[PDB]
Amino acid sequence: MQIQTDVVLPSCKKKAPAETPVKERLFIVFNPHPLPLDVLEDIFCRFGNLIEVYLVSGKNVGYAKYADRISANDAIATLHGKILNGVRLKVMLADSPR
């Protein structure tokens, strides 16, 4: 599993239980192609309270469900605009994209 990034990351945290009701949602937009799912889970669990991350099939869009608003905001502040494994990322609130 590759981790090549230009940002300092927190350690991996445990995911919230899969059935946890969703509190915050993020769009992840990949330029030029999406990243593998295991990489995405490793990266996005690091902010805590990650319920799930998945890709929209065959598209450059992923979706991050968090059990905590502050955690998702941390993921935005840390990852938006950064490069991961050769891919540029946009991370934004799903309900109000920038």
Residue numbers in the entry: 369 to 466
Quoted passage from the original study:
To determine the structure of the C-terminal RRM (RRM3) of RBM45, we tried a series of different RBM45 fragments containing RRM3 for crystallization, and finally obtained crystals of a fragment from residue 370 to the C-terminus (hereafter named RBM45RRM3) and resolved its crystal structure at 2.4-Å resolution. There are four RBM45RRM3 molecules per asymmetry unit, containing residues from Gln370 to Arg466 or Glu467. The last nine residues at the C-terminus, including the NLS, are disordered in all four molecules. RBM45RRM3 bears the canonical RRM fold, which is characterized by a βαββαβ topology. The four β-strands form an antiparallel β–sheet in the order of β4–β1–β3–β2, while the two α-helices are located on the same side of the sheet. The exposed side of the β-sheet is predominantly positively charged, indicating a potential RNA binding surface. The overall structure of RBM45RRM3 can be well aligned with the AlphaFold-predicted model with a Cα root-mean-square deviation (RMSD) of 0.42 Å (for 86 residues). The major differences occur in the N-terminal loop, C-terminal loop, and some other loop regions, and these regions also show diversity among the four molecules in the asymmetric unit. The β2–β3 loop of RRM3 is much shorter than those of RRM1 and RRM2, whereas the α2–β4 loop of RRM3 is a little shorter than that of RRM1 and significantly longer than that of RRM2. The most significant difference is that RRM3 has a distinctive N-terminal loop surrounding α1 and touching α2 as well as the α2–β4 loop.
RBM45 is an RNA-binding protein with roles in neural development by regulating RNA splicing. Its dysfunction and aggregation are associated with neurodegenerative diseases such as amyotrophic lateral sclerosis (ALS) and frontotemporal lobar dementia (FTLD). RBM45 consists of three RNA-recognition motif (RRM) domains, two at the N-terminus (RRM1 and RRM2) and one at the C-terminus (RRM3), and a pseudo-RRM domain in the middle. In this work, we identified that the C-terminal RRM domain of human RBM45 (RBM45RRM3) sequence specifically binds GACG sequence RNA and solved the crystal structures of RBM45RRM3 in apo form and in complex with a single-stranded DNA that mimicked the recognized RNA.
